[PDB]
Amino acid sequence: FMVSLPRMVYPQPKVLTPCRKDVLVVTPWLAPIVWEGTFNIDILNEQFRLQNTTIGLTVFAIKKYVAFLKLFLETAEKHFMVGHRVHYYVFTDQPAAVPRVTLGTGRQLSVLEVRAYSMRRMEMISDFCERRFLSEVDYLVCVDVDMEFRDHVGVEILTPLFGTLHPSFYGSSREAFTYERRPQSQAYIPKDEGDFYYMGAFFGGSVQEVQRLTRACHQAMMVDQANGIEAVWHDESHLNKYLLRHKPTKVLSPEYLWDQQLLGWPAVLRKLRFTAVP
Amino acid sequence: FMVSLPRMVYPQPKVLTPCRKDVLVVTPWLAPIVWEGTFNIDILNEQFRLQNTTIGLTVFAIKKYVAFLKLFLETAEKHFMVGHRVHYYVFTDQPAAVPRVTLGTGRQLSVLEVRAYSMRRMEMISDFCERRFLSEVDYLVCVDVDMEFRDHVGVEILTPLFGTLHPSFYGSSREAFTYERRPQSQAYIPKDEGDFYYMGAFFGGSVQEVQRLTRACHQAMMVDQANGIEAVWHDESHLNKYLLRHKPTKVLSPEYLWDQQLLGWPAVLRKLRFTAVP
Ligand SMILES: O=c1ccn([C@@H]2O[C@H](COP(=O)(O)OP(=O)(O)C[C@H]3O[C@H](CO)[C@H](O)[C@H](O)[C@H]3O)[C@@H](O)[C@H]2O)c(=O)[nH]1
Ligand SMILES: O=c1ccn([C@@H]2O[C@H](COP(=O)(O)OP(=O)(O)C[C@H]3O[C@H](CO)[C@H](O)[C@H](O)[C@H]3O)[C@@H](O)[C@H]2O)c(=O)[nH]1
Ligand SMILES: [Mn+2]
Ligand SMILES: [Mn+2]
Structure with missing residues (x-):
C-alpha cells in the first residue's frame, strides 16, 4: 500500500514542451531512458522514502581490484542513494584489505568472502546470496569496482529491471554492437536483432528480477562451458541476451557509466555520474 | 514469471533520435506519456499475450445513455485490445435495452443491473464488484459510454495506474485547470499544485490499483456529501485529487480522449483513437 504524497510546489510539466529534444527518453516498449532533465528528484525521493526503500549495492573486489574500494565507497557515500537506506555487499578474496570507510546514517556494509579464480559474479549474486538479499533489501544494484561516483545516482534508477547503455555504443548501429555472434553460444544474437548494447x-x-537475471545468465554460462565456448564479453554477453529477451523496465543513459579519458564530455551528457577509474 | 520473447525483427531504437520531439513523452516521475510513435505495438503485444492478459472494460449506460451502447461496443470490437482477452461489464438500469453485439473470439460481455439516480460509478466499481474483478481480469479500464473508438486502443495503455489528459487542458497552465478550488472539499487542489488535468x-x-482509486474517491465523495458540498466536476474532481497524490504509472495523451467537433484535428495528434459522440 502506497500512502499519499504530501503537498509539493514544483514546476508544472507542460505536454507541449519536451524536457529533452536531443535524445530518446522512452524505449519502444515504454521504458523510461533516464537522462538529466527527465525527472524531478524531489517527487521520486518522496515516493521511494514513503516506501522506506532499501537499496543493496553489490561489488566484487578480487585480487588487485581491492585497491579500488576506498574511492568507490567514499564516493558512493557522497552520491549514491543519499537519504535512503543502503546496504553494501562487498565480495572479496581479501576481507582484511577492505578499507575502513565512514558511512552516513542508515547505511551498512557487509564483507563477504569468496574464492579467487567469468561465472563468479552471476553465480554469487544468484545461488549463494538469494535468501540474504530477499530478507534485507528491496532493490539490488550490481556494479564494477574500478569506478567512482562523481554526481547524483539515486532512486530515479529504481524499477523492476534495468540495464545501462554502454558508453562506446549508444550512438552505434546494432550490427556494430559487440554481441556474441557465434550461433553455438547461448548468448548468440544475430545481426538483425538487438535494441541496445548494455554494459x-x-x-x-x-531482488526478484535480479535473481531471475543472474540465475538465467549463470545457467546459460554453464551450458556454454559444457559446450566448450566462452562468450566474447563473458557475463556481459549473457546480460545482453537476457535483456533482449526480457526487456528492462528502465534504461540508464551513459551519464550512469562513462569513461572521460576515452570519451571526453559530450554536450549530450549534462552530468557524468559514475565513471571509470584509470 | 515472464517467459522469453521470441526472436523479432524490427527497427533499432536510436538513442540520439527521439521518436517525438514535439511533445513530452515522459512525466517528471518517469511515467511514459503514450503518444503515437513512442511504442512498438508488436513488442507490447508479445509481452502482454505471453502473460495471457485479460482486460476488463467497465461502462455505465443509465437512462437515455443506453442509446450510445451499440456504437460504443461495435467500435470497441474493431479497435479495443483486439487479439487479447476482453471482458465488458455494462452497468445499466435497463438490461433489456443493451444491444445484441457480435463479439470476436476471447471476448465476453456481462450485463450488470444497477439502480438509476455522482457517487454511483466509483462506489459500483469498488464496493459491489471488488471480488468479481479480482477473479476475472488483470486490468480494469473505466470509460464513458458517449464515445466511439476510431483507431487502435491497445495494451500500450496497460500499467498499474493510468489517467488520460483531458483534451481541453493539455496545453493549459495549471491555474486554468478546473480542479475543485474550495478548501472545504476533499477534492481541493490549490492554484500552485497539479501536474495535469485528467478526464x-x-x-x-x-484491478488492485483501480479498486484503491475508486474506494478512495468514493470515501472522499461521502465526506463531501456529509459536509454539504459537491465538487465542481463530481467524480472527476476526486479522480484529479487522487492522481495528484498517487502518481499514475502511465499517462495517456489526448489521442485517447478527443472531441473532434469541439477541437478539430491538430497536427500534434497523429491518431484520434477514442472520441466523443455528438
Ligand atoms: O581481477 C579481477 C577482475 C575483475 N574483477 C571484478 O570484475 C569487474 C569487471 O572486470 P573489469 O572492470 O576488469 O572489466 P572491464 O574491462 O571494465 C569490461 C568493460 O570494458 C571492456 C574493455 O576493457 C569492454 O568495453 C566491455 O564491454 C566492458 O564491459 C571489476 O570491476 C571487478 O569488480 C575483480 O574484482 N578482480
Ligand atoms: O444520465 C446519465 C448520465 C451519465 N451517465 C454515465 O456517466 C458518464 C459521464 O457522464 P457524461 O458523459 O454526461 O459526462 P461529460 O459531459 O462527458 C463530462 C465531460 O465533459 C464536461 C463538459 O460537458 C467537462 O469537460 C468534464 O471535464 C468532462 O469530464 C456517461 O458517459 C455515462 O457513462 C449515464 O449513463 N447516464
Ligand atoms: Mn570495469
Ligand atoms: Mn462523456
Whole structure:
C-alpha cells in the first residue's frame, strides 16, 4: 500500500514542451531512458522514502581490484542513494584489505568472502546470496569496482529491471554492437536483432528480477562451458541476451557509466555520474 | 514469471533520435506519456499475450445513455485490445435495452443491473464488484459510454495506474485547470499544485490499483456529501485529487480522449483513437 504524497510546489510539466529534444527518453516498449532533465528528484525521493526503500549495492573486489574500494565507497557515500537506506555487499578474496570507510546514517556494509579464480559474479549474486538479499533489501544494484561516483545516482534508477547503455555504443548501429555472434553460444544474437548494447558494469532491479537475471545468465554460462565456448564479453554477453529477451523496465543513459579519458564530455551528457577509474 | 520473447525483427531504437520531439513523452516521475510513435505495438503485444492478459472494460449506460451502447461496443470490437482477452461489464438500469453485439473470439460481455439516480460509478466499481474483478481480469479500464473508438486502443495503455489528459487542458497552465478550488472539499487542489488535468472518461490500471482509486474517491465523495458540498466536476474532481497524490504509472495523451467537433484535428495528434459522440 502506497500512502499519499504530501503537498509539493514544483514546476508544472507542460505536454507541449519536451524536457529533452536531443535524445530518446522512452524505449519502444515504454521504458523510461533516464537522462538529466527527465525527472524531478524531489517527487521520486518522496515516493521511494514513503516506501522506506532499501537499496543493496553489490561489488566484487578480487585480487588487485581491492585497491579500488576506498574511492568507490567514499564516493558512493557522497552520491549514491543519499537519504535512503543502503546496504553494501562487498565480495572479496581479501576481507582484511577492505578499507575502513565512514558511512552516513542508515547505511551498512557487509564483507563477504569468496574464492579467487567469468561465472563468479552471476553465480554469487544468484545461488549463494538469494535468501540474504530477499530478507534485507528491496532493490539490488550490481556494479564494477574500478569506478567512482562523481554526481547524483539515486532512486530515479529504481524499477523492476534495468540495464545501462554502454558508453562506446549508444550512438552505434546494432550490427556494430559487440554481441556474441557465434550461433553455438547461448548468448548468440544475430545481426538483425538487438535494441541496445548494455554494459555489464551497472545493472539491477528488484531482488526478484535480479535473481531471475543472474540465475538465467549463470545457467546459460554453464551450458556454454559444457559446450566448450566462452562468450566474447563473458557475463556481459549473457546480460545482453537476457535483456533482449526480457526487456528492462528502465534504461540508464551513459551519464550512469562513462569513461572521460576515452570519451571526453559530450554536450549530450549534462552530468557524468559514475565513471571509470584509470 | 515472464517467459522469453521470441526472436523479432524490427527497427533499432536510436538513442540520439527521439521518436517525438514535439511533445513530452515522459512525466517528471518517469511515467511514459503514450503518444503515437513512442511504442512498438508488436513488442507490447508479445509481452502482454505471453502473460495471457485479460482486460476488463467497465461502462455505465443509465437512462437515455443506453442509446450510445451499440456504437460504443461495435467500435470497441474493431479497435479495443483486439487479439487479447476482453471482458465488458455494462452497468445499466435497463438490461433489456443493451444491444445484441457480435463479439470476436476471447471476448465476453456481462450485463450488470444497477439502480438509476455522482457517487454511483466509483462506489459500483469498488464496493459491489471488488471480488468479481479480482477473479476475472488483470486490468480494469473505466470509460464513458458517449464515445466511439476510431483507431487502435491497445495494451500500450496497460500499467498499474493510468489517467488520460483531458483534451481541453493539455496545453493549459495549471491555474486554468478546473480542479475543485474550495478548501472545504476533499477534492481541493490549490492554484500552485497539479501536474495535469485528467478526464474522468478514461482511467484504469491493475484491478488492485483501480479498486484503491475508486474506494478512495468514493470515501472522499461521502465526506463531501456529509459536509454539504459537491465538487465542481463530481467524480472527476476526486479522480484529479487522487492522481495528484498517487502518481499514475502511465499517462495517456489526448489521442485517447478527443472531441473532434469541439477541437478539430491538430497536427500534434497523429491518431484520434477514442472520441466523443455528438
Ligand atoms: O581481477 C579481477 C577482475 C575483475 N574483477 C571484478 O570484475 C569487474 C569487471 O572486470 P573489469 O572492470 O576488469 O572489466 P572491464 O574491462 O571494465 C569490461 C568493460 O570494458 C571492456 C574493455 O576493457 C569492454 O568495453 C566491455 O564491454 C566492458 O564491459 C571489476 O570491476 C571487478 O569488480 C575483480 O574484482 N578482480
Ligand atoms: O444520465 C446519465 C448520465 C451519465 N451517465 C454515465 O456517466 C458518464 C459521464 O457522464 P457524461 O458523459 O454526461 O459526462 P461529460 O459531459 O462527458 C463530462 C465531460 O465533459 C464536461 C463538459 O460537458 C467537462 O469537460 C468534464 O471535464 C468532462 O469530464 C456517461 O458517459 C455515462 O457513462 C449515464 O449513463 N447516464
Ligand atoms: Mn570495469
Ligand atoms: Mn462523456
